[PDB]
Amino acid sequence: DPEIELFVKAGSDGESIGNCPFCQRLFMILWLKGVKFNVTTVDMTRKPEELKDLAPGTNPPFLVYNKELKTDFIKIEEFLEQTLAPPRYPHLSPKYKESFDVGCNLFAKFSAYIKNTQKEANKNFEKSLLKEFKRLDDYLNTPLLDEIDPDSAEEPPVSRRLFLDGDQLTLADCSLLPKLNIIKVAAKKYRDFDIPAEFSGVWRYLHNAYAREEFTHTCPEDKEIENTYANVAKQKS
Numbered sequence: 188d189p190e191i192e193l194f195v196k197a198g199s200d201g202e203s204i205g206n207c208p209f210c211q212r213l214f215m216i217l218w219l220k221g222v223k224f225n226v227t228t229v230d231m232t233r234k235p236e237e238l239k240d241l242a243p244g245t246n247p248p249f250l251v252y253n254k255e256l257k258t259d260f261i262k263i264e265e266f267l268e269q270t271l272a273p274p275r276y277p278h279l280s281p282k283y284k285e286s287f288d289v290g291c292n293l294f295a296k297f298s299a300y301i302k303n304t305q306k307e308a309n310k311n312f313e314k315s316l317l318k319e320f321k322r323l324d325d326y327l328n329t330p331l332l333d334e335i336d337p338d339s340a341e342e343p344p345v346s347r348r349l350f351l352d353g354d355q356l357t358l359a360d361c362s363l364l365p366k367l368n369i370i371k372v373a374a375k376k377y378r379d380f381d382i383p384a385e386f387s388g389v390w391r392y393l394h395n396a397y398a399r400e401e402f403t404h405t406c407p408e409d410k411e412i413e414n415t416y417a418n419v420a421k422q423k424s
Contacts, residue, residue, distance in 0.1 A: 188222050189252055191217065191252055192224065192250065193226045194227050194228075194250065195226060196210050196231060196247045198407060198408070198414075199410075199414055201232060202228055202230070203228065203408065204226075206369070206412045206415045207248065208369060210247060210248040211364075212264065212362055213248050213267070214405040215360075215401050215402060215405050216264060216358065217267065218401040219277065220267070220271045220276045231247070240256075244258065252266070252270070268280055279356070280357065280358055281352035281358060281359040282331075282352055283332075283359075285326070286351040286357065289322060289323050289351070289363070290351075290359065290363030291362075292319055293316075293370070294366040294369075294370065296312075296319045297366075297369075297370045297373075297374060299315065300315065301373055301377060301419065301420055302420075304422055306423065309422075313378070313380070320382060320386055325388070326351070327346060327348075327351070327391065327392050328345055328387070328388035330343050330348075331346070331348070331353065334348060334353070347391070350395065365406070368402075368406050369415075370382075372409045372412040372413060376420075377416055
């Protein structure tokens with residue numbers, strides 16, 4: 188294997204894994220590739236010391252691959268998917284771009300919702316979030332074009348696939364799952380929001396996903412997520 192060290196955001200104690208969904212994204216990618224790697228946390232309250240190195244534009248997440256520094260979010264993902272490739276490593280890119288797009292819109296609506304300072308606007312922001320969850324629910328319940336149901340074969344009426352793009356974890360899941368974890372924790376804490384039980388596709392996905400260590404063991408403690416929104420989630424009225 189190559190020498191890989193992933194530098195992620197440290198939590199409140201300056202040591203634990205912090206709330207950083209792109210850090211978690213990269214953590215999951217490395218785990219799913221099956222490559223040997225280390226994860227080091229960076230205490231962003233001690234930048235002069237922790238930011239070694241440097242090149243001032245270096246900020247977590249960043250990664251050192253055989254001594255080469257790699258930076259800037261998606262560029263790191265692209266490099267890893269390219270370099271850790273078959274025959275030796277598994278291909279993780281999803282077949283369908285839509286598997287990405289459904290996740291980015293959802294997190295944006297949550298962000299608007301959790302940052303809304305006007306309690307009187309809560310109904311609209313909540314409806315907005317729910318509508319995007321319904322989009323995700325629909326995506327997860329609608330069979331993909333290449334989908335073969337294990338029990339009923341091709342062209343099934345409803346989807347029972349495990350994950351966004353099929354039955355294997357892909358980059359699309361590495362993007363969305365950390366964000367879904369954030370939404371679930373933060374929205375419950377600060378808006379008493381639960382993801383509706385009626386969204387059976389979303390819940391099927393969550394159950395499948397929380398059964399995979401690659402996701403659950405890369406999550407920060409819930410309180411790190413709660414800490415992120417402690418100030419911005421305060422409302423007028």
